Design an enzyme around this catalytic site. Sequence first.
Site, PDB file in Angstrom:
ATOM      1  CG  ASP A 127      -1.951   1.115   1.171  1.00  0.00           C
ATOM      2  OD1 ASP A 127      -2.001   1.849   0.161  1.00  0.00           O
ATOM      3  OD2 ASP A 127      -2.700   1.269   2.158  1.00  0.00           O
ATOM      4  CB  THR A 170      -1.798   7.524  -2.933  1.00  0.00           C
ATOM      5  OG1 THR A 170      -3.124   7.710  -2.421  1.00  0.00           O
ATOM      6  CG2 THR A 170      -0.813   8.273  -2.047  1.00  0.00           C
ATOM      7  CB  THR A 171       1.696   5.057  -6.109  1.00  0.00           C
ATOM      8  OG1 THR A 171       0.725   4.442  -6.965  1.00  0.00           O
ATOM      9  CG2 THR A 171       1.666   4.378  -4.746  1.00  0.00           C
ATOM     10  CG  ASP A 220     -11.165   3.714  -0.946  1.00  0.00           C
ATOM     11  OD1 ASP A 220     -10.921   4.875  -0.558  1.00  0.00           O
ATOM     12  OD2 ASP A 220     -10.437   2.737  -0.670  1.00  0.00           O
TER      13      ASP A 220
END
Lengths: 76, 518, 543
Positions: free
Chosen positions: B48, B81-82, B386
């Site tokens: 994650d 997010t990445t 989400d």
Amino acid sequence: FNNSRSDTLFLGGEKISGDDIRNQNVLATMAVANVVKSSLGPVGLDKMLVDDIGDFTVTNDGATILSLLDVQHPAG
Amino acid sequence: ERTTGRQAQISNITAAKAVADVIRTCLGPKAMLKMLLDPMGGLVLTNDGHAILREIDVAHPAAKSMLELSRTQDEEVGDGTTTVIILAGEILAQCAPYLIEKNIHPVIIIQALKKALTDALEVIKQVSKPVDVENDAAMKKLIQASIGTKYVIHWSEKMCELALDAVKTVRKDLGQTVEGEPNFEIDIKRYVRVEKIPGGDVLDSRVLKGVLLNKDVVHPKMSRHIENPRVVLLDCPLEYKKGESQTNIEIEKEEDWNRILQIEEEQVQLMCEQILAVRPTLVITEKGVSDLAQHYLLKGGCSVLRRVKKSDNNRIARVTGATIVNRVEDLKESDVGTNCGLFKVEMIGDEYFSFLDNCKEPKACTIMLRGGSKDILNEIDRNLQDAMAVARNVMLSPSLSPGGGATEMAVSVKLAEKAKQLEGIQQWPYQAVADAMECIPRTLIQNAGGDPIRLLSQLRAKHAQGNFTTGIDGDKGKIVDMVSYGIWEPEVIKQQSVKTAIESACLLLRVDDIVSGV
Amino acid sequence: QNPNAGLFKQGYNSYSNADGQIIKSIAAIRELHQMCLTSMGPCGRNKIIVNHLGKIIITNDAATMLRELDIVHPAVKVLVMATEQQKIDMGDGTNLVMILAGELLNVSEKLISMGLSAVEIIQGYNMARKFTLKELDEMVVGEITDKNDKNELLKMIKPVISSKKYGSEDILSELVSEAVSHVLPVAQQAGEIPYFNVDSIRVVKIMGGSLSNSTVIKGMVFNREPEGHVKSLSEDKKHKVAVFTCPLDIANTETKGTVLLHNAQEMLDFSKGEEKQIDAMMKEIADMGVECIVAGAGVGELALHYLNRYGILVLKVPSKFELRRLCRVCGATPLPRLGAPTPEELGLVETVKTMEIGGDRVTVFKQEQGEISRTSTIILRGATQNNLDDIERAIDDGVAAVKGLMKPSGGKLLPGAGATEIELISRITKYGERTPGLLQLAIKQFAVAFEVVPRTLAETAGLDVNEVLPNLYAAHNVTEPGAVKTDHLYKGVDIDGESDEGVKDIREENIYDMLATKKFAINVATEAATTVLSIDQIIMAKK
């Protein structure tokens, strides 16, 4: 490259006089002034000021940078 | 102590590159695992993106700015997010040789990044395709992107119903040239706040229109539902009051007790008589309620609810219309119980509830979550957030963008085509932006195992001739069209990713000096 | 404690290619590449070279530097041999090969860090080279008619004097062009016999005066004085000259023939013997029409006496190197014997006199409009002896540059001063995105490697690279409504010492690069860059 070892005038502290302190006054005020030289004017840029806890902040205000600037030498 | 000159520019590049380099392999469903050894002896094998960097402490301040950027980015979009960290870190990495080896002034680059941001957002709008937000079948296939590879995949149809019914109550759809367009503003945080109820089944999860309160009724035997409820909201508690003087009550002699108790029963009765003058069926007090006030309102034929938060009464006022009143003697006639369907004392799982729900939508709903255990409730909770985040991105704009590196590569091609007429010194840092756009599909290939040089060369040449919708498959890793296998992300993910990346790139290039100390 | 692995040969230091040894090889060139970046251009810098014999040398030319440097590392050694390839076949363009081949390897580091295979890197430059040579043929604008006019020679010599001697460019051009036109014949449709040898132009110098007082002689000048009492010849046309290897004395034997003395009676006969024999031989030389005798060996006392009565100028040249070029003017041949001046060995000279050059008297050898001379002399004058010697090195390189104007396609020209390299950037990148495959990565980087030439001239001129360079890129990018492209092929890199809003045009100063110089420089630079990229490892042994 330093100024020390008076080897006379027994005292409870160091003493620096002559062109020795005159160079220290220039080197001290130079590093302090070089901080805000890049922030001068509207085209100037800001910088990050880190504290001892490890946090920091960024501002382009010269009055805030100099207030948060830590100057070791008394000449600065 | 102090870092000045070009040395701070090197440290700003090294810090942002080191933070990104960790999560560069964390992008994609095939993303490789990361092993983080804790100083206490433990380790974390999870891939994650946010869970890793959160447990990693950094020194350089630019490395902390990249961590705070992801925290703000997570509030906008729930996933990707990445994606933002790689893009924000690669732009500074691609502008690194120009900033130092080519000796380009940072303001020249920052001024060029503002033009590259505007051109990049226009290309995203060109490659994007419209989508119908009113189609229920289309919205379920969208939210499903944040559903699959999770435990909620079996209930996914119900997971979308919880997300859709929640955003439809909060959404305000309006537009005109008169009062302006809200641009479909939806607040998931405050109004959509979930309530997790233990027991039951996931299929029993409902979207309740109204407010929910866990505090029970002060009396065991009370009316279970009210046909036409009259709600009264007030602040000051119901109890025997105190004078403005130093008067104290100390009773020793046995026959002096009934003198003060009669005054206590009289003063509380007068406070309850002021409430019963309008003949309410419901009494809700912000503060506590004395036992004597409970009995006077018990025989008065009204339900009493003690200790309700002030923030709750404001939401109670919207589902009802009861005017907030401070002093018990100040109760206004504008206080009404209209537009309230029923008052339910219903108990689920040995827990008493309160239902003020009505038949209308007062812009705010209440989500009632059920499950087989608390771990399932926490799983449904974060998965619904989400699910609502992707639903929010679709309701805040009716456009979809191709994923899997399709949009990332399509922009890099259009930036290079526009860069031909951009002649002048700003062209050099501009072309570094397009080279940073190719890093996102590069990490997907490196995580896939295919040849990065051969595929990216054929992928970029595919956009130069064929359609911009041809991306990279996540499971396979071979160049494919996004028409066959869709992988359609909302544009809001691409919007905020490019906007915050240029702002973060301009943030690090704007700091040329680093000073420590207070 | 720590064992060793990977080196099985002997005690050594083993360098594996997995550490980026090919990058370290380019890094070693980058140390030498930065040396050449301050050389090319009229604004370039001079390097002080201290010879191993304790001699101080200050020159701009980098070929002298590489000659004085002893190279080991192969990637640099190939560039030294590649510099000799440019130095032997042409007298100009040595800085073009060292800078370009160095930048080709610099931009290759981006492909190496990307993971692109070295063989695929070489294949990209080879395909881009054929695309470049195809353009270099179309980059030709003008071509010289080979009229050999002075003004036409000034167009070729003017850019050659630049990048070596600046400020003398217009002064030295009139001096060199005059000496070339003397030894350069005017002919066409003949390619069998080569013309304009490097030895055709001799350069002499003397202290005093300046470059304004310098003159050009149509023939060779000798430092030695007219030992004989005859200072100069007459005004008669076609004076015959005789070159004798044998010294001037009584006739001797070709093999040994050393005169020995025993008694004083023989010395009286040796004196009268030298009187009758020399007077007999020198008289027959004057009867044949020879008014000048060039003696490669010593001259006797009685030999001077009789030649002065016959009016023959005595001229001695002990240097055999000057006699070799002397045979290329009059056509005389040296005679090993004495007394038989065969007319086939006799030359023809129009004028032999004694001129005062810099305060010293010298006997010249020259002609006027007849028996065309293949050797000329440039007389240089200057106040500083050190700077006057550097001018001689700049003129000698200018002579070898005119050698590139011969038959092997030396008439065609390309725009210089960085004008050609900029256009090749847009043409190659046009072929890069057009050619499918992985070659587009190396082809596009091959055009970016040409950005070093305009940047180098800008860095040496003190100009801002953030200004002139982007204005120079937009200068060659235009939109023309038609097939023929126009507006400006003439935008170069600016040489200004007094600023200038924007950049100037090549048509103004007529500063250009030759095709034979540019096309040969590309072939050498690529093969030098290919050789470095071809070496993925090194092997050495104990000496």
